């Protein structure tokens, strides 16, 4: 297809078939080649030290995650980040009712909010126990990343001065969340362990636990 | 005192999907050089090799029904078998039932035949050129 755009003529169809055939040979070698490079140890853009989990957070039952984390780290996490897929669409409801509190006891949470979901984010992180303390802002056009806090952060674990509340797009016209965010988290916690929910394959940085339906 | 590299390894084994990480624990990079949804697993590949024995080279549809519960890509099947026999075009083997042991030998012969005429690329012998 589309039906409309194809030739209905015998001569058009014959030449199209001829050109499709050459093209298939062309892309065949590209596939075989690609597939071979992969076999002989090619390396992905993913950093070595990240924990990708492909799951659905509605279905996901966090307890295994919690148990596994306690088991290997002895602490729950220090920073949680979320770019919810607002109504690919989850109703306000099932995002809201996630049992996030189990996930962390003492640290920071970062949540992305389009202007429509901005207020909703406030009272959903308050529900999870957090106190609103900050907002980063991204210019490209603006979107807010709302920051909240729970527990004691008076440990040496979290460093008090924050590099910026403004963040800037890596590249013109960009729609993936900027990288500088990961660095700022690095400021707040250096070499702590962090969890991301609703993660994408580009969202993976080593030392991070990332969970998402597309990872 | 936390060793992250070990940390990632442990976490992955207990939480990650089997395609994502090795029993080793280390990160399976091949999974991320492919689009999500389209990963070809090692249990997929034996399924295919089984299907050549039972149904024959041409019949991708019958294979898809029996071995993949209908969920494979028929084109991917065709392409994967080209690799299995080491030739670029397999119309020659169409209809044939081949043995997992025979397929290696067929492919070995085809690479043999291949390397020599100098039509050999990326481990496939290009009987068809253009």
């Amino acid at each position: 297809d589309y039906l409309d755009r194809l030739p209905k003529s015998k001569k058009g169809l014959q030449g199209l078939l001829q050109d499709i055939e050459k093209r298939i040979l062309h892309y065949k070698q590209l596939f075989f080649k690609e597939q071979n490079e992969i076999a002989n140890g090619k390396r992905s853009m993913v950093p070595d030290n990240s924990i990708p989990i492909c799951s659905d957070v509605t279905k996901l039952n966090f307890q295994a995650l919690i148990d596994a984390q306690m088991r290997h780290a002895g602490k729950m996490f220090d920073v949680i980040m979320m770019d919810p897929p607002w109504q690919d669409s989850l109703s306000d409801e099932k995002i809201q009712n996630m049992p996030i509190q189990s996930l962390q006891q003492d640290g920071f949470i970062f949540v992305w909010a389009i202007n429509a979901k901005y207020r909703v984010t406030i009272k959903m992180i308050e529900n999870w126990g957090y106190k609103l303390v900050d907002e980063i802002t991204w210019v490209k056009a603006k979107e807010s990343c709302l920051i909240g806090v729970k527990g004691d952060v008076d440990n040496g674990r979290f460093k008090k001065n924050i590099a910026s509340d403004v963040i800037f797009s890596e590249r013109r016209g960009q729609s993936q969340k900027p990288e500088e965010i990961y660095q700022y988290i690095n400021q707040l916690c250096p070499n702590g362990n962090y969890l991301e929910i609703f993660a994408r394959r580009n969202n993976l940085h080593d030392n991070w636990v990332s969970i998402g339906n597309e990872l | 005192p936390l060793d992250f590299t070990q940390y990632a390894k442990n976490m992955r084994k207990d939480l990650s999907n089997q395609d994502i990480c090795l029993e080793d624990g280390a990160l399976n990079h091949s999974y991320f050089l492919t689009k999500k949804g389209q990963y070809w697993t090692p249990l997929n590949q034996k399924a295919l090799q089984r299907g050549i024995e039972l149904f024959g080279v041409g019949n991708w549809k019958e294979i898809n029904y029996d071995e993949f519960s209908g969920k494979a890509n028929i084109v991917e099947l065709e392409l994967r078998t080209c690799m299995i026999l080491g030739i670029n075009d397999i119309t020659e083997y169409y209809g044939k039932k081949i043995s997992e042991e025979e397929q290696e030998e067929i492919k070995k012969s085809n690479i043999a035949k291949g390397k020599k005429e100098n039509k050999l690329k990326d481990n496939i012998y290009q009987k068809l050129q253009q």
Binding site: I20, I24, Y27, F31 | -
Partner: peptide, 25 residues
């Protein structure tokens, strides 16, 4: 962007439709 396998799937699907229009003819 399309991957090599997606392109080949489109090409194969196309070919069928053609071959079938050459059939119908």
């Amino acid at each position: 962007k399309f991957t090599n396998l997606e392109i080949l799937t489109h090409l194969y699907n196309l070919k069928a439709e053609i071959v079938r229009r050459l059939a119908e003819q």
